Nucleic acid binder design. Structure first.
Length: 205
DNA sequence: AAAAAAAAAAAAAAAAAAAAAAAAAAAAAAAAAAAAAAAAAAAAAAAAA
């Protein structure tokens, strides 16, 4: 869907191909910079599938881009600070493949704490063996495979949504005073979730 | 005991400057020789009893 979206996977990408590489200009005295995945996803989305399988030499580069939204490269005669304003959409498998609901999120995925701490939302998709949901998922899959071009009735075309999103990304909403107060109250409640007495949450607030 | 790691650690390929090596390269002027010609001195043969 997205323009400026790049899809990469776990152990198929090197650091240079994930962030930045330098090659010399064949015609002049300058250096031309090869954009990697996190540059081609600037103001877009980088989709890292199999995020748990990425090597630490590459996880550090993802982490640096997720920190300060840049890629500083010093290679082959040129240094340059590139720019990476990329959202990250990552998919990770749990340790041993199956998510263990009797453990914290840290005990379930081998992501480093620096990586995990700067993900806004974690979504746990546990396979619960529910016959009703099995029926519903099976029905939708079979309907997709029976009516290919139809069976999708989406109220807004993807081009419409792309235009709409390009437009709406130009808005910079303010936070009003009442929004400040409500944010503070919601944060207080969220932290109250983290207290003792009540059961453990999968990860701290 | 094997299963991921996580380095050496070797190769091929690249760069990447050095620092050395390699490759390009006729025409203009002169002089000497040999030949001429020219001013001067010198050496010939016609004059007469």
């Amino acid at each position: 869907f997205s323009p400026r979206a790049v899809y990469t996977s776990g152990k198929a990408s090197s650091a240079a191909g994930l962030t930045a590489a330098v090659v010399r200009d064949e015609e002049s005295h300058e250096f031309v910079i090869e954009a990697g995945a996190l540059m081609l996803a600037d103001n877009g989305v980088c989709c890292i599938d199999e995020f748990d399988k990425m090597d630490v030499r590459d996880q550090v580069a993802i982490h640096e881009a997720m920190e300060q939204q840049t890629i500083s490269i010093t290679k082959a005669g040129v240094k340059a600070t590139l720019n990476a304003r990329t959202s990250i959409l990552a998919a990770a498998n749990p340790i041993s493949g199956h998510y263990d609901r009797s453990k914290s999120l840290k005990q379930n995925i081998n992501l480093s704490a620096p990586i995990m701490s700067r993900f806004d939302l974690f979504f746990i998709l546990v396979d619960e063996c529910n016959e009703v949901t099995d029926y519903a998922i099976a029905r939708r899959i079979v309907d997709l495979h029976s009516r290919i071009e139809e069976s999708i009735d989406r109220v807004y075309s993807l081009d419409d949504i792309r235009r709409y999103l390009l437009f709406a990304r130009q808005f910079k909403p303010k936070i009003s005073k009442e929004s400040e107060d409500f944010i503070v109250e919601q944060y207080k409640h969220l932290r109250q979730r983290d207290g003792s007495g009540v059961t453990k949450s999968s990860w701290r607030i």
